[PDB]
Amino acid sequence: MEGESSISIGYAQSRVKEDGYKLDKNPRGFNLKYRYEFNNDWGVIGSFAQTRRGFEESVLIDGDFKYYSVTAGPVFRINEYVSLYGLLGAGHGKAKFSSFGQSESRSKTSLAYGAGLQFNPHPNFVIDASYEYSKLDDVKVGTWMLGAGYRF
């Protein structure tokens, strides 16, 4: 309802794909979302996401990946239980490869686009789920987010 805020924290998981290379389903992290309802039907939502795949000890060339994004947009309340939203903002990716002794890294900022929903099983609770896409030159990053929190 009007004047109410929702804050949530959640899992984020990315798939990363460049044509000619295998899809990378590993990067993981988190998502914070903050929603404010201006009236009983319309509001705004902001999102920060980060995912990464770093050094993991395992059993010649190792890689490191990081993605984050800041997006925002309008949220439309359908009824007491469900609201839908669309987001726009920026994504930033960085990839680094090292051996032995030597390394190269690339980073890129591009538009990020998202869409999601919020479910209120109780008026003061939030379950949040969304998808985000960003194309960083030839590298596509798709990120799913699933979180929870409170509305007050």
Side-chain angles (χ1 to χ4, degrees), residues 1-14 16-51 54-55 57-60 62-65 67-99 101-103 105 107-152:
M1 311 184 71
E2 182 160 324
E4 292 182 342
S5 299
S6 304
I7 178 65
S8 57
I9 193 170
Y11 300 96
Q13 178 136 212
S14 299
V16 180
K17 173 75 190 205
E18 181 180 344
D19 293 343
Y21 301 90
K22 188 161 30 163
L23 177 88
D24 184 356
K25 300 177 186 186
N26 302 111
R28 290 190 289 267
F30 71 93
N31 172 223
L32 296 162
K33 292 213 183 73
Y34 169 78
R35 175 185 176 180
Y36 186 88
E37 290 173 69
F38 299 121
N39 63 47
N40 288 332
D41 302 275
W42 301 339
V44 58
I45 185 159
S47 173
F48 167 82
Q50 95 160 30
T51 60
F55 164 83
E57 226 127 48
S58 66
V59 309
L60 298 179
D62 213 333
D64 185 297
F65 173 85
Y67 172 80
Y68 60 94
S69 69
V70 174
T71 59
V75 45
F76 300 89
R77 175 164 297 280
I78 308 180
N79 50 46
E80 311 160 54
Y81 305 107
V82 182
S83 303
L84 307 175
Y85 58 79
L87 306 178
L88 181 66
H92 179 80
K94 176 163 194 291
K96 178 188 189 352
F97 298 85
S98 305
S99 72
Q102 153 189 204
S103 83
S105 70
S107 86
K108 173 73 178 181
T109 305
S110 192
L111 291 171
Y113 313 89
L117 56 86
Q118 301 212 320
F119 173 55
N120 307 113
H122 176 283
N124 300 112
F125 298 86
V126 191
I127 300 181
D128 175 82
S130 78
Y131 173 80
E132 178 171 290
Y133 174 79
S134 182
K135 190 165 185 175
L136 308 171
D137 292 330
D138 292 329
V139 178
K140 296 165 278 175
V141 183
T143 304
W144 282 97
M145 301 172 207
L146 173 64
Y150 303 98
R151 177 162 72 139
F152 51 97

